[PDB]
């Protein structure tokens with residue numbers, strides 16, 4: 382009974398991060414020890430004519446990005462663990478997330494390490510127009 | 513190629529919207545085309561779902577610098593025989609809103625302690641994972657009848673994990689700097705450990721210079737077995753599965769080859785006592 386959500390290539394990393402005190406540090410350390418990034422994300426097909434904003438209601442990739450389903454790029458959603466936000470809710474689940482093509486091999490690691498500018502809506506260091 | 517880890521146990525016929533699905537596998541077929549997914553104008557997100565996600569199938573085979581191995585060899589376990597705590601869990605099954613996973617019900621230890629938990633699972637929602645009470649029933653059959661009264665005597669998990677840490681600390685503080693859980697067919701015991709174990713690099717006690725065996729979510733602090741009052745998680749435990757040592761039948765038949773003082777009283781603690789007793793007879797007698 383039931384429907385699978387995961388593939389065996391992700392079992393080790395998800396188990397490690399599901400038990401960690403600090404899941405983000407565990408994922409960073411797993412990668413630094415030679416582990417593969419989490420796969421089986423929700424990658425979208427789009428027109429690559431979007432606004433390029435980081436977190437959007439519909440896919441908004443520009444020609445320098447890819448669009449993904451938001452929950453699938455969130456380590457806390459992927460491991461089914463608590464979110465660090467004060468009220469414990471997610472800012473990615475229920476939205477699409479734009480990720481620079483140069484980083485699209487590891488969308489989960491990208492979202493853990495980067496920050497969205499609250500003024501222009503683009504990733505700091507990857508589109509932010511506020512200097 | 514799929515795994516049962518994080519299997520969605522809901523009875524919802526359809527998959528999830530692309531923005532809400534944790535994975536490509538979990539996206540509904542309606543959004544899948546040309547090898548990936550599409551957003552479809554006019555198709556809403558689901559804002560009221562509760563999907564039970566299974567914790568059966570963890571794999572602790574990573575090798576990460578500075579993080580100790582959880583599962584240890586028979587030789588390492590023998591050196592730490594004073595840290596051995598037999599551990600067994602009897603589960604109940606998800607029912608009604610979900611089916612297909614086992615939830616911890618009676619947690620038993622070689623100290624003779626049995627702790628009963630409210631049936632609790634990991635329910636994905638549109639905003640988070642809700643660790644919450646779920647509908648459950650004991651497995652049917654006469655061998656499981658004793659679990660029936662336990663369905664209404666459970667304690668919330670926040671109380672159970674504090675009691676586990678206190679019991680382990682009271683037992684081991686003058687015996688070892690660690691715990692080695694002694695298991696027989698470890699899968700469900702490892703699933704149960706998700707509810708009360710955390711891992712990370714080796715740390716020391718907040719209140720003294722000893723190795724940390726406990727963690728507190730209240731303060732993000734670490735304690736040894738002597739200063740862990742009020743601590744809620746077991747930190748960096750070790751474990752070994754005795755069944756992997758070449759035995760062929762059930763636990764009781766192998767235990768009974770060397771021991772006659774532990775009659776089976778059909779309870780999690782008795783299975784935990786038999787498991788540690790079998791390991792001790794195999795390694796030291």
Ligand SMILES: CN(C)C(=O)c1cccc(O)c1
Nearest residue numbers: 438439529531551555556557
């Ligand atoms: C994309 N989804 C699922 C929406 O809920 C939505 C929200 C705002 C505008 C819009 O066109 C669609």
Ligand SMILES: [Zn+2]
Nearest residue numbers: 455457458471
């Ligand atoms: Zn999330």
Ligand SMILES: [Zn+2]
Nearest residue numbers: 498501509511
């Ligand atoms: Zn900006």
Ligand SMILES: [Zn+2]
Nearest residue numbers: 717720736739
């Ligand atoms: Zn201490």
Ligand SMILES: [Zn+2]
Nearest residue numbers: 771773774789
């Ligand atoms: Zn015995």
